[PDB]
Design a binder for this molecule. Structure first.
Ligand SMILES: NC(=O)c1ccc[n+]([C@@H]2O[C@H](COP(=O)([O-])OP(=O)(O)OC[C@H]3O[C@@H](n4cnc5c(N)ncnc54)[C@H](OP(=O)(O)O)[C@@H]3O)[C@@H](O)[C@H]2O)c1
Ligand SMILES: NC(=O)c1ccc[n+]([C@@H]2O[C@H](COP(=O)([O-])OP(=O)(O)OC[C@H]3O[C@@H](n4cnc5c(N)ncnc54)[C@H](OP(=O)(O)O)[C@@H]3O)[C@@H](O)[C@H]2O)c1
Lengths: 314, 314
């Protein structure tokens, strides 16, 4: 069995990967909570790698937040993510861990990228300011992996998810992430019998959403590809793989779907006196599809199962 | 007196800053060699800051090299520079050091940047591959400074030098840095009585060169500006300041000048069957000039004094 360390296993993404692997008789999971191992502490991280015989690492630990958190604590987001990534990568290398999967984010891409965004859009223009600090730390993570691959012949791969939703999300109505926010807002609206729910903007912008269990399955799929196959479909200094659906959805279609899924009978209302973001943002997932992975969970199905998970965990 | 820690003080840039400050009765220098303090060791760096009452830091320590070194050891260049920067910045903050000057490099800029390159070119396109790893670590350094400035109201400023030359450079004929390389090549050619020296390319590309003592004076100048003045001439998320001459020189003019400076009487020869780089690369130094600093050392004068330093230190 392969000994697989999923950093950040109690996280949204980490716990999705754990649920899938825990069904694998060919895998032994090695897991440490934050209390047991602070991944900011280089010495602790090296001690763990030196004593635990790891074969593969899924790097799913990170300082994460929404718009307010990213603009309010920028130092926390660049420092902590640079240090977690640096410590784990360095320790992995030092202890002969050859396989690693780094989980980044689509925030890496330029604000005005060409759509849909191919992996080659990386570094082609200015970042969104709200996410700039975290985005630079995640690009540094990808370039750490690439650099160790190139200097030492490592196999440290990377995926960049689109917007994710599903179990273990933060279902507060003030989350800036639209799916959990709206699930919770429509849930409460449905409880109060509120006549309407008002969403800022016209509803016209197009966005992309992937269920976290699809993310986890794609991530495992990418981790487990033959190296020769992964190499044929990437480039040493352009090595990351976008993970998503590659399909747009309007915020209007999303909000009307969530209303249906929760059984809301009032009105979804869009207040177009508020600004819209860009008209379209989504990943080009041609590389992942060429590597033989396609998502399985439709928005409708994913929303319904996610909402059921929230009901069970209120 | 202000207690000033110059990280990397025995380096080319660090030692230039030290020579200038050591003439300041208002400054007490705090210096630690690599052997005394390994800046990769977070615990050691924090212990130093916690016991040494520092007021200002000049961050002039880095893993540095030429074209071969950067392409051969990419992991070393991204990892080491990320960790030195992260450790010093974090420790400074933690111990109430309010003033810091981070020394980056013009390698940060896109390969196809608009010339001359204004600070706003940062992040506008693809990096030169040879330097990509180091460049991402230095951009992460600038964004660490910005992030601490914005979250905690720190005063962590940054300068990006152009190509530098002067005392304490590496004067081996195989240095990929053209000034020390050519000084040493013409020096040897002059000793051997070699009939010619052949330089690859046509000589037409334009490049920018600044003497290291000018860099040091500009760096001190930028460190010491009133915060209100520095703020008026920068932007929180676009805070770095280019340091250079803002003036182009052909590689042909450079090589013919070096030949004159060393007293070579053979021929400078350009072999145009080898490729040239881009036609022009230089910094726009309007922000530094607006902040009231202008370089003092002409290329001719700088070359002559640099060569005299090499003669004295062979
Ligand atoms: N929609 C999404 O969820 C989404 C979208 C795009 C990309 N991603 C990428 O996926 C990665 C994981 O996202 P996520 O939402 O799954 O995060 P989470 O799931 O909210 O948290 C991941 C976790 O890693 C842990 N961690 C952070 N710092 C640690 C430390 N110093 N020591 C040990 N553990 C530490 C956290 O610990 P403590 O939580 O207990 O604080 C947290 O449990 C992120 O890098 C994110 O950018 C996620
Ligand atoms: N032409 C130029 O020189 C030039 C141009 C553009 C930008 N810059 C920027 O200026 C900065 C300094 O450049 P430079 O040429 O002055 O470098 P140097 O002068 O060649 O070396 C700087 C030094 O900092 C030290 N250092 C590195 N790692 C350390 C560690 N782990 N612990 C303690 N000290 C450490 C080095 O120690 P050990 O040397 O003894 O290994 C070295 O003495 C760099 O970031 C460079 O990118 C320089």
């Amino acid at each position: 069995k392969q000994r697989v360390f999923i950093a950040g296993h109690r996280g949204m993404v980490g716990s999705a990967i754990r649920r899938q692997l825990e069904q694998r008789g060919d895998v032994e999971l090695v897991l440490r909570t934050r209390d047991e191992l602070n991944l900011l502490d280089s010495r602790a991280v090296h001690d763990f790698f030196a004593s635990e015989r790891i074969d593969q690492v899924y790097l799913a630990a990170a300082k994460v937040g929404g718009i307010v958190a990213n603009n309010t604590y920028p130092a926390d987001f660049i420092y902590q993510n640079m240090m977690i990534e640096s410590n784990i990568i360095h320790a992995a290398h030092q202890n002969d861990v050859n396989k690693l999967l780094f989980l980044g984010s689509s925030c890496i891409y330029p604000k005005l990228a060409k759509q849909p965004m191919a992996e080659s859009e990386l570094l082609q223009g200015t970042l969104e300011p709200t996410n700039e600090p975290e985005a630079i730390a995640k690009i540094a993570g990808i370039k750490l992996c690439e650099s160790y691959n190139r200097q030492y012949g490592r196999d440290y791969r990377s995926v960049m998810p689109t917007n994710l939703y599903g179990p273990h999300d933060n279902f507060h109505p003030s989350n800036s992430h639209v799916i959990p926010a709206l699930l919770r807002r429509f849930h409460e609206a449905t409880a109060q019998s509120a006549p309407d729910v008002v969403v800022w903007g016209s509803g016209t912008p197009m966005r992309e959403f992937l269920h976290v269990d699809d993310m986890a399955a794609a991530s495992i799929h990418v981790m487990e590809l033959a190296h020769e196959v992964w190499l044929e479909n990437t480039q040493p200094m352009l090595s990351h793989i976008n993970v998503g659906t590659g399909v747009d959805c309007t915020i209007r279609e999303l909000a009307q779907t969530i209303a249906k899924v929760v059984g809301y009978k009032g009105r979804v209302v869009f207040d177009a006196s508020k600004p819209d973001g860009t008209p379209r943002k989504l990943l080009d997932v041609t590389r992942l599809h060429q590597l033989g992975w396609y998502h399985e969970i439709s928005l409708e199905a994913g929303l319904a199962s996610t909402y059921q998970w929230f009901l069970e965990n209120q």
